[PDB]
Design an enzyme around this catalytic site. Sequence first.
Site, short mmCIF file in Angstrom:
data_model
loop_
_atom_site.label_atom_id
_atom_site.label_comp_id
_atom_site.label_asym_id
_atom_site.label_seq_id
_atom_site.Cartn_x
_atom_site.Cartn_y
_atom_site.Cartn_z
N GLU A 1 53.70 53.92 45.12
CA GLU A 1 52.90 53.15 46.04
C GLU A 1 51.60 53.87 46.35
O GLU A 1 50.53 53.26 46.33
CB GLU A 1 53.64 52.90 47.36
CG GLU A 1 52.77 52.14 48.38
CD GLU A 1 52.55 50.69 47.97
OE1 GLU A 1 53.53 49.92 48.07
OE2 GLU A 1 51.43 50.32 47.53
N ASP B 1 47.95 52.51 44.88
CA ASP B 1 46.95 52.13 45.86
C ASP B 1 45.63 52.85 45.59
O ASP B 1 44.56 52.23 45.56
CB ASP B 1 47.41 52.53 47.26
CG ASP B 1 48.63 51.77 47.70
OD1 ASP B 1 49.19 52.14 48.77
OD2 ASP B 1 49.01 50.81 47.00
N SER C 1 51.42 44.97 46.89
CA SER C 1 50.77 46.17 47.36
C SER C 1 49.62 46.61 46.47
O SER C 1 48.82 47.48 46.84
CB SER C 1 51.78 47.32 47.61
OG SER C 1 52.75 47.45 46.62
N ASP D 1 41.42 28.03 43.05
CA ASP D 1 42.59 27.39 43.66
C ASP D 1 43.89 27.59 42.88
O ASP D 1 43.96 27.25 41.71
CB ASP D 1 42.32 25.88 43.77
CG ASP D 1 43.14 25.21 44.86
OD1 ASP D 1 44.19 25.75 45.20
OD2 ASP D 1 42.74 24.15 45.36
N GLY E 1 49.84 24.17 46.30
CA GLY E 1 49.36 22.81 46.20
C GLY E 1 47.87 22.90 46.20
O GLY E 1 47.32 24.00 46.15
N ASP F 1 47.59 27.08 50.72
CA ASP F 1 49.06 26.91 50.62
C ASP F 1 49.78 28.19 51.03
O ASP F 1 49.22 29.27 50.97
CB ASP F 1 49.52 26.46 49.21
CG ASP F 1 49.19 27.46 48.13
OD1 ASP F 1 49.75 28.60 48.12
OD2 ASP F 1 48.38 27.08 47.28
#
Length: 357
Positions: A78, A82, A278, A316, A334, A338
């Site tokens: 992690e 990052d 993450s 989108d 959708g 959403d």
Amino acid sequence: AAPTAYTPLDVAQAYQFPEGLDGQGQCIAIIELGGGYDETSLAQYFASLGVSAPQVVSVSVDGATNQPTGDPNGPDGEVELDIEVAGALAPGAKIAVYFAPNTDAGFLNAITTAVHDPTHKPSIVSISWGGPEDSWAPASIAAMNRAFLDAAALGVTVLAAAGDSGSTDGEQDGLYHVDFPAASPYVLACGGTRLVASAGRIERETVWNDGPDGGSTGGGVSRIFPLPSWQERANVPPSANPGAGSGRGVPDVAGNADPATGYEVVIDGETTVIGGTSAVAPLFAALVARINQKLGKPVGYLNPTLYQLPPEVFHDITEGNNDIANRARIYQAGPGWDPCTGLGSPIGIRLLQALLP
Ligand SMILES: [Ca+2]
């Protein structure tokens, strides 16, 4: 599906990050609750991408320290993921890593320590740690939210991974749950997609959902925070939890997170592929770093502004759902905002452009 992977630069190109900007003059804070990072694998990784390695420094909170455990499969994954994702994309920025003990108080203190840091002065803080909102102690959530409110007031952006276990967020109580701090209306909640792209375009981008075993993006409707006023035009649905209460919709935005179309990084000397939400917070934090550079000032709290930008600023995501618990497909993507991908994946140049006064 044939498993693939991208380097952070490849994803940034697909999301059309602004060229000629690298975070120069910006400072990105990253919160860590355990593990550590070794400079050998960071130097190798940055060298490998041909970017000038950003200065990275660790800050100690409540006695916590940068302590890599050597396990490429543990928390180092992690920490280094990052750092590598944010630094590779905003190499001109300075990275400040805050290590705090893995407690509610440590998490909070790490957050407040970075936001008000006079030595490192970050304008952005990346959070890839969290838990279902319903499991946190109310007092913790209240103090965390305030700190996030303070960050907003001071002009510091705060991004958080929305979670990697779909709409149930890994709980087995039969209900749906959104993750915190993602749920805070003051943080930019980062969801996940399965991205198929080349440098010239995105061939396909859908909701990240590999089922119970592979993970899926967090997303849904908060049970704690009411619908923000600036999110009232996003058509957030009422929670799917019998009771149907209204509330803040998660996430706000999304980016590639599916490990089957993951990120190539080097963890504890090991070259691999890691994904999940993450990776998305640092991804967009570097995006924010570039915008901040170009603009004279820090963009800070972005949510209200994001939700009022024209459609062209976002790709989108309309396909998929983030349900890994049952067949109800709860929280499906959708057209428009959403509970899986929010406004979708941003288009760098257009976002920058929209915010260029
Ligand atoms: Ca959508």
